[PDB]
Scaffold this active site. Structure first.
Site, PDB file in Angstrom:
ATOM      1  N   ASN B 368      31.581  83.932  20.199  1.00  0.00           N
ATOM      2  CA  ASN B 368      31.241  82.912  19.177  1.00  0.00           C
ATOM      3  C   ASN B 368      32.034  83.113  17.896  1.00  0.00           C
ATOM      4  O   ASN B 368      32.943  83.886  17.899  1.00  0.00           O
ATOM      5  CB  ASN B 368      29.759  82.967  18.837  1.00  0.00           C
ATOM      6  CG  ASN B 368      29.362  84.250  18.152  1.00  0.00           C
ATOM      7  OD1 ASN B 368      29.787  85.312  18.541  1.00  0.00           O
ATOM      8  ND2 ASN B 368      28.566  84.166  17.116  1.00  0.00           N
ATOM      9  N   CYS B 370      32.852  84.627  14.443  1.00  0.00           N
ATOM     10  CA  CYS B 370      32.738  86.056  14.087  1.00  0.00           C
ATOM     11  C   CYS B 370      32.337  87.008  15.220  1.00  0.00           C
ATOM     12  O   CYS B 370      32.085  88.188  14.956  1.00  0.00           O
ATOM     13  CB  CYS B 370      31.795  86.298  12.896  1.00  0.00           C
ATOM     14  SG  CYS B 370      30.071  85.697  12.991  1.00  0.00           S
ATOM     15  N   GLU B 372      30.280  88.270  17.739  1.00  0.00           N
ATOM     16  CA  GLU B 372      29.338  89.302  18.149  1.00  0.00           C
ATOM     17  C   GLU B 372      28.553  88.949  19.407  1.00  0.00           C
ATOM     18  O   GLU B 372      27.931  89.842  19.992  1.00  0.00           O
ATOM     19  CB  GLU B 372      28.359  89.649  17.002  1.00  0.00           C
ATOM     20  CG  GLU B 372      27.148  88.727  16.844  1.00  0.00           C
ATOM     21  CD  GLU B 372      27.494  87.368  16.219  1.00  0.00           C
ATOM     22  OE1 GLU B 372      26.741  86.394  16.452  1.00  0.00           O
ATOM     23  OE2 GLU B 372      28.508  87.267  15.488  1.00  0.00           O
TER      24      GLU B 372
END
Ligand SMILES: Nc1ncnc2c1ncn2[C@@H]1O[C@H](COP(=O)(O)OP(=O)(O)OP(=O)(O)O)[C@@H](O)[C@H]1O
Ligand SMILES: Nc1ncnc2c1ncn2[C@@H]1O[C@H](COP(=O)(O)OP(=O)(O)OP(=O)(O)O)[C@@H](O)[C@H]1O
Ligand SMILES: Cc1cn([C@H]2C[C@H](O)[C@@H](COP(=O)(O)OP(=O)(O)OP(=O)(O)O)O2)c(=O)[nH]c1=O
Ligand SMILES: Cc1cn([C@H]2C[C@H](O)[C@@H](COP(=O)(O)OP(=O)(O)OP(=O)(O)O)O2)c(=O)[nH]c1=O
Ligand SMILES: Nc1ncnc2c1ncn2[C@@H]1O[C@H](COP(=O)(O)OP(=O)(O)O)[C@@H](O)[C@H]1O
Ligand SMILES: Nc1ncnc2c1ncn2[C@@H]1O[C@H](COP(=O)(O)OP(=O)(O)O)[C@@H](O)[C@H]1O
Ligand SMILES: [Mg+2]
Ligand SMILES: [Mg+2]
EC number: 1.17.4.1
Lengths: 680, 680
Positions: B368, B370, B372
């Site tokens: 996704n 950023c 994580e």
């Protein structure tokens, strides 16, 4: 430099001052004997040819299988019995460069003109061998020309859709915008030209739910559509002139436009009710409207209401939001943009619906690319994914044009009109568009076709009649009245034979009878003796024949909701040796360069002793041309693609005077001289 | 200039050289007594407040109706019993400017911090009044912070979706591209951040049907997506590094890019199998592949095959089309772009799937915004309009982060982890996304949550431990092992209580048992005495407790396919008085200007006698920071948002040495220091 090109350029080397118009007969003979004839694959027999073409995926198999090969051989022999010779170089060039089937590696010719015609006629006839012969003669006599989508594709494997002209309604929701983007792309991957009505989308700065001031407006949806048409390998957006976004919508097409707003692959068209023209004439400040405030207040799309009745009520209603504009300056802005780009296409909505036969289904609200298609439509609602959609009626139209000169010389107005209708009806019934449910639904329900005409100027000029004369209007008045007569008659015949009508036929003015009022009380036989002689040998319908047809339609109904429309004609004009559509010619002799050589095409029939009658369009009086189109339009139930031909010496007020005069005369659509998918 | 701002800037006026860190306690007192307290609507009673907020559409009614007002009053009193005081100016500023409910006209405050917490706890508890009290204490002790989508919205009318993080697979057809465009827009209008895997689309110049050389490729679909995200009021595209379009895909984000290719609202991420890293290390010319030739040959999406097993077979297969590239130069190009833009997010795919629990559902293929979230997914096929679609599994994740400092000081690792899981599970069960059928389906079937952690540096620095020390890694190894222990335990408890597991649980490594191998053979209790003392009062799981949990999971299964992931923390970091996520701090004192005034925020807990321990990230050794993240990542089943902090004095080869070292240590995703929807 080839010999046919040699003789071709010798037209422009004058003899006793005259041009050498007969050199071009040499040039096309040279072009065949010294080239075409030597790159045409020739088979020992027809069955060997056809078997090769079926076995190598060139042709389709199913339509041929409906015939015994003895019958396929008779049909082909009929085509070749004409001994058809192209009369000019460029006419043969355009058929072999643009239509004749070539091999997958593009090195040799698989189709002569007689082969493409035989295959199309075998397709149209759908097993009826005698009908195939009837179609072969009609096409080889060059009496009728099906549109390029149909004429090019019929009988081919890897064949594109026979219909390539589509119009879409778009409802005012994200679901509907997403679905219009996908339909646009699905139709466009099939080679279709797609026109979308954006008049129901709410304007810039309207509410979404309860967030005020949240909408991007019409221009935001144009940006997405522009991109969809880019990705999928030409489209149009129409907007009603009373939509608040009208100015922003027009500005996206200023050539100087910023790229934050620039839309580059979309044509535009503007829909103008009578109320706007009155407001511009009166130089009275007018209002444009935020469509969603009208929807929240009246429960109806502004697009679906009568602006001539509702304008003052909208202005006074405090819950309706509006903006002030200058109608004269907006009208002037439309003239500027059309000088830049030919379009925006202008549609005079009340000129369309004053004479529209199916207002019961809906008013006509917009048009297609080059703006000849004028049919009712009803918007869908594509709901959430888990829910049923509500499928409306979009529009698609199947086009063809009869060739006025050959129809007159064969005295075959009735036979051509009825046969061409049969063919357009077959293309309509063999269409199944997927991924466009309202197009698919409207084609079955409306069964609309669009039969047109070409070679009007050519025929007039070769019979000593100037395009601008009252005699020319007198010939057009009668000829197109007769086209309309036999068109309605054949549609009623098909209705009796099949026992069906188009859905909701009985609400139409054909059923209630008032469609026929002018034809049962006014005579449309020629007022000029020399024009009446042109029709000798053909019965011209009288008010009594119209009364009996009115009665016939009343008993059997009609198969087609729409029948006639005059599209432009593209390359095929050359193949038909025909002046383009019903427009006046632009040049007496076209000079175009192809592959390091210059080619000359004099207008079909241009001789030294009729030079005066091939008057170039830009030297004509557009007010007289408007008079001619308005005359034809009386007898055409849809529209006529109509380009004004103007010198750059025209003030912006001269341009608006033409606009107002076109509106006055009842013209339905107009623009100035990308439509490739919607031309015959 | 206000008095709280006055005292705030006095921090930066040094006394005995020291900063005036205590001035900020004055500044926030001044900010309340002289401002906040006077713009807070205060009601005669709570029922008057709540009735006002329900009657004026501020709050929702249904969740409150599940309680007797005597119980709602007890819950609110619990929140106020803490007597919670913000310890800094900026922490209170950020809550009231970004989270506290204001009136529709935005002039007065309807919510204190205790009110928002009481409403969220009443929502999470779903009628269980005692549980609501448990949630109130956990939030007012600042032990747990639900994500901003959840913390901001819960209990509100006109409330946005509690989940705002979504990942989509896109199949290789026009139907699927059109549907991804609409899903992207539908999720994005709800405030979601949307990431799409483009690795299955065929590359530029591949066939469509039998037309060779016809595809626009991945960049064409990025242009459409970029536009969709523009229209609907942030998205991401991921591409596998072996896709032929990888270079063109990266180039769309060069800041110098031409506007024929410029994509402006899309983040990008790159997925890198082990085989690529080996090829770059060996400086051997590598191949990238045209994915459709692999599909036509193997019947499978290249994206769904194991490149480490298939690379050489693809290279040798003559029916597979490929291109040569330089892997080192591509790796260098990834370093350049990340210096420009932070992203492209790099995902080391085999570092993800070496330890992935659900490869039986699928390999993890992308992430996704950023980067994580790391979960299995299966592509849909959205077929023609008249046909049934085949709905796969997309991904959405519900986030929250426990606050390490307050969890340690309350000795409540177990209670916080289990309660926060309950809350994330409730957000998952009350989500119903419409117009995104594979998101909706995967949320019911996978029941995945993402519990994270913040304040790692803050807690370490306030206990005399440097972020880069082996002691810090030793604290993280134990703390996150314990988080994982009680997380798995609570998920198995919920599985026993409800009698369900996530769909196809029994194919997971949790069911076959090998997930637990390192936990039943290796001890994760602290190796350093001073670290072990930090855990005094809390039982630390041994290999025997892990063996009994393995046995427990074997009998009851697990409710959640994924449980842990460490997102970034945005503004809420201030409200929690917490250093951001598990990252080191960037500045000891932040100077930011707001409304013509300059504000200072020293790091939570920054004192003169711990100054050495708040070492700024840019002065740290990124190779040691990689060591820390790799330590935490052992015990996190999804991923960790990990930004490298680099001086511009880094050669392109120094940058790739960090990349290779991260890969070596088993880091799953990395980028450099638009994610707003996917941050806690
Ligand atoms: N490549 C081709 N080779 C031969 N005939 C062709 C070809 N393409 C079209 N035709 C047409 O097919 C029709 C029948 O052709 P074919 O050569 O089989 O018969 P034929 O020898 O002329 O007469 P018959 O069949 O009576 O012996 C003719 O009208 C011919 O023009
Ligand atoms: N605007 C508000 N006005 C009053 N109480 C509020 C408001 N917002 C939140 N509360 C909280 O509601 C809870 C109950 O408030 P309320 O004023 O009705 O009771 P009280 O007079 O303090 O005690 P009791 O109900 O026993 O008389 C308190 O914890 C208070 O902090
Ligand atoms: C979601 C969205 C819609 N629109 C446009 C598309 C439509 O023309 C219009 C309405 O969108 P809809 O999808 O119909 O919105 P809605 O049904 O939630 O709200 P309402 O009841 O007000 O209809 O707004 C935007 O301009 N930007 C957006 O982000
Ligand atoms: C129609 C179309 C598709 N595409 C892309 C989208 C998909 O990634 C890919 C295939 O599109 P599809 O819609 O799957 O085409 P198809 O099913 O008719 O043909 P095939 O059997 O070869 O799949 O081509 C374009 O690039 N431009 C286009 O105009
Ligand atoms: N103008 C033309 N249009 C179509 N075909 C032509 C034309 N000129 C020549 N051809 C083709 O080339 C062949 C050779 O021409 P030619 O022998 O001069 O005429 P013909 O066969 O009538 O005696 C013709 O049989 C015909 O098939
Ligand atoms: N740091 C703070 N955090 C939260 N609320 C505060 C803070 N400082 C002041 N307030 C609010 O302003 C009110 C007035 O403050 P004050 O009278 O100084 O404290 P107290 O009420 O504990 O004696 C407090 O009751 C509290 O509601
Ligand atoms: Mg709506
Ligand atoms: Mg396909």
């Amino acid at each position: 430099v080839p010999k046919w090109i040699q003789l071709n350029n010798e037209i422009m080397i004058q003899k006793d001052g005259k041009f050498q118009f007969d050199k071009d007969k040499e040039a096309v003979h040279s072009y065949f004997v010294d080239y075409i004839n030597q790159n045409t694959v020739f088979f020992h027999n027809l069955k060997e040819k056809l078997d090769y073409l079926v076995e190598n995926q060139y042709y389709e198999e199913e339509f041929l299988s409906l015939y015994s090969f003895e019958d396929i051989k008779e049909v082909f022999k009929t085509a070749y019995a004409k001994k058809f010779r192209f009369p000019s170089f460029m006419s043969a060039f355009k058929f072999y460069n643009d239509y004749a089937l070539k091999t997958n590696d593009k090195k040799k010719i698989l189709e002569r003109y007689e082969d493409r015609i035989s295959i199309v006629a075998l397709f149209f006839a759908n097993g009826d061998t005698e009908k195939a012969k009837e179609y072969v003669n009609l096409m080889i006599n060059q009496e009728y020309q099906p549109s390029t989508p149909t004429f090019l594709n019929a009988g081919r494997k890897r064949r594109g859709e026979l219909v390539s002209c589509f119009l879409l309604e778009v409802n005012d929701s994200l679901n509907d915008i997403s679905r219009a983007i996908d339909i646009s792309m699905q139709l466009s991957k099939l080679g279709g030209g797609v026109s979308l009505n954006l008049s129901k989308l709410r304007a810039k700065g309207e509410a979404i739910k309860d967030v005020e001031n949240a909408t991007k407006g019409v221009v935001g949806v144009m940006k997405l559509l522009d991109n969809a048409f880019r990705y999928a390998d030409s489209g149009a957006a129409y907007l009603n002139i009373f939509h608040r976004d009208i100015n922003d919508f027009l500005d996206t097409k200023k050539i100087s436009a910023d790229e934050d707003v620039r839309v580059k692959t979309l044509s535009i068209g503007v829909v103008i009710p009578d109320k706007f023209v009155e407001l511009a004439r009166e130089d009275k400040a007018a209002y444009v409207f935020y469509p969603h405030t009208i929807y929240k207040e009246y429960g109806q799309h502004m697009d679906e209401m009568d602006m001539n009745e509702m304008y003052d009520k909208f202005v006074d209603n405090p819950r309706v939001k509006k903006e002030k504009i200058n109608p004269r300056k907006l009208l002037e802005k439309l003239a500027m943009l059309r000088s830049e780009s030919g379009y925006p296409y202008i549609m005079f909505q009340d000129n369309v619906n004053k004479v529209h036969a199916n207002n019961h289904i809906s008013k006509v609200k917009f048009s297609n690319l080059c703006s000849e298609v004028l049919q009712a439509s009803q918007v869908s609602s594509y709901t959430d994914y888990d829910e049923e959609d509500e499928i409306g009626l979009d529009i698609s139209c199947n086009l063809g044009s009869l060739n006025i000169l050959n129809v007159m010389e064969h005295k075959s107005i009735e036979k051509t009109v009825k046969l061409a209708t049969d063919s357009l009806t077959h293309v309509s019934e063999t269409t199944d568009i997927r991924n466009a449910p309202a197009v698919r639904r409207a084609n079955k329900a409306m069964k609309s076709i669009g039969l047109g005409a070409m070679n009007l100027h050519g025929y007039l000029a070769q019979n000593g009649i100037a395009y601008e004369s009252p005699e020319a209007r007198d010939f057009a008045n009668t000829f197109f009245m007769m086209v309309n007569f036999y068109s309605i008659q054949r549609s009623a015949e098909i209705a009796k034979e099949k026992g069906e009508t188009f859905d909701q036929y009985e609400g139409s003015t054909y059923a209630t009878g008032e469609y026929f009022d002018k034809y049962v009380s006014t005579d449309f036989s020629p007022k000029y003796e020399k024009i009446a002689n042109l029709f000798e040998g053909m019965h011209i319908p009288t008010t009594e024949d119209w009364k009996k047809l009115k009665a016939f339609v009343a008993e059997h109904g009609m198969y087609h909701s729409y029948r006639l429309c005059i599209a432009p004609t593209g390359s095929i004009s050359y193949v038909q040796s025909s002046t383009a559509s019903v427009m006046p010619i632009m040049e007496r002799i076209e000079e175009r360069t192809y592959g390091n050589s210059k080619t000359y095409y004099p207008m079909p029939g241009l001789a030294s002793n009729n030079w005066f009658f091939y008057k170039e369009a830009y030297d004509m009086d557009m007010f007289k041309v408007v008079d001619m189109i308005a005359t034809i339009q009386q007898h055409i139930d849809q529209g006529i693609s109509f380009t004004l031909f103007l010198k750059d010496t025209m003030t912006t007020r001269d341009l608006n005077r033409i606009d107002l005069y076109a509106h006055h005369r009842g013209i339905k659509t107009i623009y100035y001289a990308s439509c490739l998918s919607c031309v015959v």
